[PDB]
Design a protein around this nucleic acid. Structure first.
Lengths: 65, 65, 151, 116
RNA sequence: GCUUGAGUCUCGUAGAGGGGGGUAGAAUUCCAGGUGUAGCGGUGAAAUGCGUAGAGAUCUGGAGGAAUACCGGUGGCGAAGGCGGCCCCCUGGACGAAGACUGACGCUCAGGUGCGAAAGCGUGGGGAGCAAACAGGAUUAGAUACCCUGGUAGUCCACGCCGUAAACGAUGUCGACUUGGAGGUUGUGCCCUUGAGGCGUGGCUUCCGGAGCUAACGCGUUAAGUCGACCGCCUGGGGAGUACGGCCGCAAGGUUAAAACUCAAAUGAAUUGACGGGGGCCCGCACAAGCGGUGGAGCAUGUGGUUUAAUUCGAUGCAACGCG
RNA sequence: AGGAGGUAAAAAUGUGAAAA
């Protein structure tokens, strides 16, 4: 976003776009707030995501590989 | 997993705005401690010192000024 | 519908030279399973095309085939959306096969003649890119350049 | 006319339409755009390919004034952000700064609720 | 009198603890001025509304207010609710290595009192954005629903009133005992500080489970486990947390709280199939990419309805309908 | 691996006595 690439700007260098803005937070910051509906959503989704941290730490299973 | 003021205790302030340019990312945004390795009360104390520069107009609200 | 694909199919060309290329016209010019009645006609349909457009039967067909040869095709694809279209350029296998589709499609109309002499009109028409089969080839060209909004 | 040399392009964008205002370092804007003034009415009005033609309305009707080296300053949303900007690049101009500067808030006034 | 009970003090730690007041920027809203253009808007789709008065829109500037994107985490404080931009004023409770001191001042507690998110009301305001009732416009069997654009009260502030929840870890309060392992957070001790270190010692919590317990799911050091103490609650569901009266409340009602009456149920976990306009994978011409038939017409045939003496009888999505 | 954007509008009633 703060990119000039002074004389050659022939390639876009669009990697500060997606994980920062233009779809990511822009589909999550505007409406549907209630001040604590995120606490009905952070407690569901991050707990579904911090177990995605933990399920690789319980990795030994019926693979046998 | 880095070394800090855990067992080799130190202080962190607001005046050193160049190092306080590191505990925000390059827009003025305070990155969480989760990525930069630091600790919560070593950031929550510093979060006031971030805003004490933002109250004193040194590290911004936004990159449009 | 899902996994396995066979290779090529095997049709039987005209009795002067082995030509699977020209047979694809002929087998689609084959109406009602009748190779025979086509064999009387598709030679006469090739009698009128070649020496009135200019070339012999090697390259006189692409006078009336490369001019009706498309370059763009469109189809509707949604990933879950507003029922929109995601188009692609088609490969050589289907492209000029679609060019042969318009010519038999133009073969039916313009009726005061025989099937032999109805094929005389459009093959002579498609030779100089003034074909009614080419007219349908010019309609498929305008289904690009504005209807490619999703990719 | 004055043939304004330095311009500042405010692509005041949304998903469907955009009132692009082709300003300068002053702010004065003789050129404009909408994706609705071009048209493609209906579902196809919700396209930044139409904002591209709106940015092509920012790429014509001003060749008389010659809007040289410019700051792309796009505000607002739009999920097709590789369509609206490069048509302004296709004008033959130069983009001095490629900025997606948006008025990002601190949540001062209340938002309503939707998607039911 | 003593001390392991409770508490006080010295030396340190922490933050949205609570009440009030100053003060900043971005976002957005209205408007003046320069430039300028025919569209702006919204959704599953569309329209409403608005714009030629020169809107949406860019920059400078004036006039506003509350919430604080990221920092910010099952982390912190507290009786609960609840409370996070920064600072200031008053003030609050808790934890710990190491000690002194009063010397069981300990625990709970109906009545009574105060507080309590939220909405409502009375007096005067903030009044920008959003927003019950309302109008117009689509979908629609009605839409008096979901949806869109404006907009009354409200959301914010001062003093009182109502004193109510899913106030939910649905688990009251206090104390003791009772394998643990993996992290977050603030303290912190002995040792060589000889690098983000080796090994212990408390509190607040998330996850898996042995002993034990349970109807089951499951709780598991904050236990539904092992015991003792005080207060409160329950006696089949529904009727009803309604009514007469009483305390209180301007109002809206809260609270204590039945009965007649009806049924033989009501309620909860789990088991196996079924169902979803839930999903992944796989298959069938289900579909995408094609040619020709059925449906318009002549002819050949069966049933139903009908008429009639019966127009044998049965079948009546199908897989009965060129069937017997 | 660690994490984000796009993700659903039309189809209702079976109101009643079918098991050792």
């Amino acid at each position: 976003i703060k990119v000039r690439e002074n004389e050659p700007f022939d390639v876009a260098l669009r990697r500060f776009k997606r994980s920062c803005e233009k779809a990511g937070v822009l589909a999550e910051v505007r409406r549907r707030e209630f001040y604590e509906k995120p606490t009905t959503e952070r407690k569901r989704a991050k707990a579904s995501a911090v177990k995605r941290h933990a399920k690789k730490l319980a990795r030994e299973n019926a693979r046998r590989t | 997993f880095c070394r800090f003021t855990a067992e080799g205790v130190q202080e962190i302030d607001y005046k050193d705005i160049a190092t306080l340019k590191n505990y925000i990312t390059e827009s003025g945004k305070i990155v969480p401690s989760r990525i930069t390795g630091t600790r919560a009360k070593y950031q929550r104390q510093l979060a006031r010192a971030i805003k004490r520069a933002r109250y004193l107009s040194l590290l911004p609200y936004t990159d449009r000024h | 519908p899902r996994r396995r694909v066979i290779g090529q199919r095997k049709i039987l060309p005209d009795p002067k030279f082995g030509s699977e290329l020209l047979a694809k016209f002929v087998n689609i010019l084959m109406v009602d399973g009748k190779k025979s009645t086509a064999e009387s006609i598709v030679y006469s349909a090739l009698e009128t095309l070649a020496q009135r457009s200019g070339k012999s039967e090697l390259e006189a067909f692409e006078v009336a085939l490369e001019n009706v040869r498309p370059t763009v095709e469109v189809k509707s694809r949604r990933v879950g959306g507003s029922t929109y279209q995601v188009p692609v350029e088609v490969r050589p296998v289907r492209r000029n096969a679609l060019a042969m589709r318009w010519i038999v499609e133009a073969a039916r109309k313009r009726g005061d003649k025989s099937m032999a002499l109805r094929l005389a009109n459009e093959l002579s028409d498609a030779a100089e890119n003034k074909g009614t089969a080419v007219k349908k080839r010019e309609d498929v060209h305008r289904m690009a350049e504005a209807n490619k909004a999703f990719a | 006319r004055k043939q304004v040399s330095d311009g500042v392009a405010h692509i005041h964008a949304s998903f469907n339409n955009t009132i692009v205002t082709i300003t300068d370092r002053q702010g004065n804007a003789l050129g404009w755009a909408t994706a609705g003034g071009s048209g493609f009415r209906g579902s196809r009005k919700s396209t930044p390919f139409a904002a591209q033609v709106a940015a092509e309305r920012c790429a014509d009707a001003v060749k008389e004034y010659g809007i040289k080296n410019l700051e792309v300053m796009v505000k607002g949303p739009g999920p097709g952000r590789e369509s609206t900007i490069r048509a302004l690049n296709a004008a033959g101009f130069r983009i001095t700064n490629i900025t997606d500067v948006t008025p990002i808030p601190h949540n001062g006034c209340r938002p309503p609720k939707k998607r039911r």
